[PDB]
Amino acid sequence: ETFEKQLKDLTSNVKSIQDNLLEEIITPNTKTEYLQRFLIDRFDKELFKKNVPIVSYEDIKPYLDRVVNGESSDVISARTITGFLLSAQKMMPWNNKYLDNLTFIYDLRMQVITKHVKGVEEGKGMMFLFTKQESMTPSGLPARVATSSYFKSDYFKNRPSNWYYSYTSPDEVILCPNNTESLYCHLLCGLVQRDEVVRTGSIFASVMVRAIEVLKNSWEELCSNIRSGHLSNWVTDLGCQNSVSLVLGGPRPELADTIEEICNQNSWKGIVKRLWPNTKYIETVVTGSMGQYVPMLNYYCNDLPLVSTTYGSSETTFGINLDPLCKPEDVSYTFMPNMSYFEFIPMDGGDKNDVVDLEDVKLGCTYEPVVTNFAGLYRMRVGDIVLVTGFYNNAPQFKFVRRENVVLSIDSDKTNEEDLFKAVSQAKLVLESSGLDLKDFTSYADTSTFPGHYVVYLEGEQFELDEEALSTCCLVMEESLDNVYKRCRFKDGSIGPLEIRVVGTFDSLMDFFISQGQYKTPRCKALQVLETCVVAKFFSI
Ligand SMILES: Nc1ncnc2c1ncn2[C@@H]1O[C@H](COP(=O)(O)CP(=O)(O)OP(=O)(O)O)[C@@H](O)[C@H]1O
Ligand SMILES: O=C(O)c1ccccc1O
Ligand SMILES: [Mg+2]
Numbered sequence: 001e002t003f004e005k006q007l008k009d010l011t012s013n014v015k016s017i018q019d020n021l022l023e024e025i026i027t028p029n030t031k032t033e034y035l036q037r038f039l040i041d042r043f044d045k046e047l048f049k050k051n052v053p054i055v056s057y058e059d060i061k062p063y064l065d066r067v068v069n070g071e072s073s074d075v076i077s078a079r080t081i082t083g084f085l086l087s088a089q090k091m092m093p094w095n096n097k098y099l100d101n102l103t104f105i106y107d108l109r110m111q112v113i114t115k116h117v118k119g120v121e122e123g124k125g126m127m128f129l130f131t132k133q134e135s136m137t138p139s140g141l142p143a144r145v146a147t148s149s150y151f152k153s154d155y156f157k158n159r160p161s162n163w164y165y166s167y168t169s170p171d172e173v174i175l176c177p178n179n180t181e182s183l184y185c186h187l188l189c190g191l192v193q194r195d196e197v198v199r200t201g202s203i204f205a206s207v208m209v210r211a212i213e214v215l216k217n218s219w220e221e222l223c224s225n226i227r228s229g230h231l232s233n234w235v236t237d238l239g240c241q242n243s244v245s246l247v248l249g250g251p252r253p254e255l256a257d258t259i260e261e262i263c264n265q266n267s268w269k270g271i272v273k274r275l276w277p278n279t280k281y282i283e284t285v286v287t288g289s290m291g292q293y294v295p296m297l298n299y300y301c302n303d304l305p306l307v308s309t310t311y312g313s314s315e316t317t318f319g320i321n322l323d324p325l326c327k328p329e330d331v332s333y334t335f336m337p338n339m340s341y342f343e344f345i346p347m348d349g350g351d352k353n354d355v356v357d358l359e360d361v362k363l364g365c366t367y368e369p370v371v372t373n374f375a376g377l378y379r380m381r382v383g384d385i386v387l388v389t390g391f392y393n394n395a396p397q398f399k400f401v402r403r404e405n406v407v408l409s410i411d412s413d414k415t416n417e418e419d420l421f422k423a424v425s426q427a428k429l430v431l432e433s434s435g436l437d438l439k440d441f442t443s444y445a446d447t448s449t450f451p452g453h454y455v456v457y458l459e460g461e462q463f464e465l466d467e468e469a470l471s472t473c474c475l476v477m478e479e480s481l482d483n484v485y486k487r488c489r490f491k492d493g494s495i496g497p498l499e500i501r502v503v504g505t506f507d508s509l510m511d512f513f514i515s516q517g518q519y520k521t522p523r524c525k526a527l528q529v530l531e532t533c534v535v536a537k538f539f540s541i
Contacts, residue, residue: 101338120198130202284307319336413489423456
């Protein structure tokens with residue numbers, strides 16, 4: 001009752017609260033070096049739109065680094081920057097207004113969920129929530145990933161006491177920095193209290209999959225812990241030791257025999273549903289690139305709804321999905337006007353404007369969002385493309401389409417098409433030194449097996465094919481990847497060895513581009529013919 005009303009109020013005078021919100025942001029911030037440079041000496045919208053440039057991270061990074069290294073927040077924000085968010089790797093400024101906003105959305109999405117999902121209030125979530133450790137900055141302020149700034153905060157520790165915030169995992173397991181340990185412990189605790197599990201998931205679908213893969217590879221050992229009442233010794237985190245011990249409590253040979261039997265069936269089909277029969281849905285994002293995990297999650301889960309709830313970034317949370325048990329391709333996020341002041345740059349002829357406000361976007365037009373927040377970012381380009389699909393009252397509904405500049409992404413890692421071409425060029429110089437000359441390049445992401453990875457097709461005085469000289473390539477291609485990438489390749493254990501598949505098959509593919517539609521090389525049916533044109537495969541290590 002209150003819900004329908006709250007959401008009605010919130011989607012209705014959108015123009016208003018967005019101006020009021022702009023007002024709240026700018027006014028204190030006439031005090032900042034950054035706004036003083038653009039002559040913003042009072043609150044004025046048009047003046048703001050006139051003088052404040054629309055920027056990218058590179059443009060403002062010189063400001064953000066000064067705060068990173070210890071200058072006053074006031075260079076960019078009059079609200080103290082109390083920390084940073086990690087996406088080299090980039091650092092967005094951050095304060096508790098992010099957590100105010102995040103928890104507002106958590107509360108809003110829980111209301112949406114129970115409104116659509118029968119019987120969720122009568123159990124616990126097995127959530128694979130992970131705390132990653134903070135880098136420190138010279139200013140002395142921590143840098144954390146988005147969810148981690150939430151966990152290492154009282155917004156989590158003192159979170160509401162009710163179904164949506166009740167997990168089968170003690171908080172020590174969620175807050176453990178070693179995710180190898182804590183993923184195991186998630187699975188152990190979830191198994192021990194398996195009847196109470198009415199939902200499961202993670203922030204993104206790749207973690208759901210990795211969790212099911214760890215389960216497949218660790219179930220024997222999980223049951224031995226359940227049999228003995230003892231956690232496996234290798235888990236060192238003291239918090240996991242004590243807390244997951246109280247959960248085990250004692251020997252459970254009976255419950256171990258029970259789960260051993262479910263796992264031992266021929267097929268892993270619907271294994272999730274068989275170990276956790278009261279599960280009603282999987283709460284994990286499967287929009288954007290994450291949609292490629294849908295077939296394999298539907299395999300393991302027996303076509304349980306995959307609910308994608310939220311759209312968000314380090315700049316801001318944008319909004320939520322108000323039709324949660326719809327299909328991934330049909331998902332739209334209804335931006336929430338109390339988060340940040342949103343603007344939008346048209347990306348098709350549908351909107352011939354230079355830039356437009358939230359309440360001004362046109363139906364069926366595509367746009368790159370533009371964020372102004374409560375932590376020092378002003379008119380910052382987000383680098384997503386969204387499509388306007390509809391309107392809840394006066395609040396628009398967006399399809400997430402694409403990330404403006406990417407080639408491949410198999411997890412947390414974002415490998416821009418520039419950091420991708422940092423390999424087509426990079427390792428080539430050493431093919432050059434031995435009697436080889438590169439021909440072409442193009443990348444794909446494989447989800448044939450877990451862990452997926454990056455697919456890459458490359459092109460007298462002998463007989464077989466050279467290995468020593470060209471297996472180095474793949475291993476020095478990787479060295480060109482980002483930090484967020486490598487982390488997942490090894491420590492998250494979410495990606496395998498990178499690889500190349502040797503295939504004049506790109507003067508041939510060039511005709512496979514006029515065949516369906518001046519033409520320059522691409523960043524990411526097509527494959528059946530390209531798949532064929534290969535003679536060998538190699539690994540890096
Ligand atoms: N529900 C969702 N659906 C589809 N994409 C989502 C999403 N939630 C987040 N994302 C994607 O993840 C991005 C925000 O993540 P961040 O926390 O900023 C790490 P990043 O993507 O590496 O940032 P960067 O590419 O700007 O450096 C969004 O731009 C969006 O592209
Ligand atoms: O669940 C979250 O906290 C979240 C945060 C950022 C982006 C998407 C999300 O679901
Ligand atoms: Mg960005």
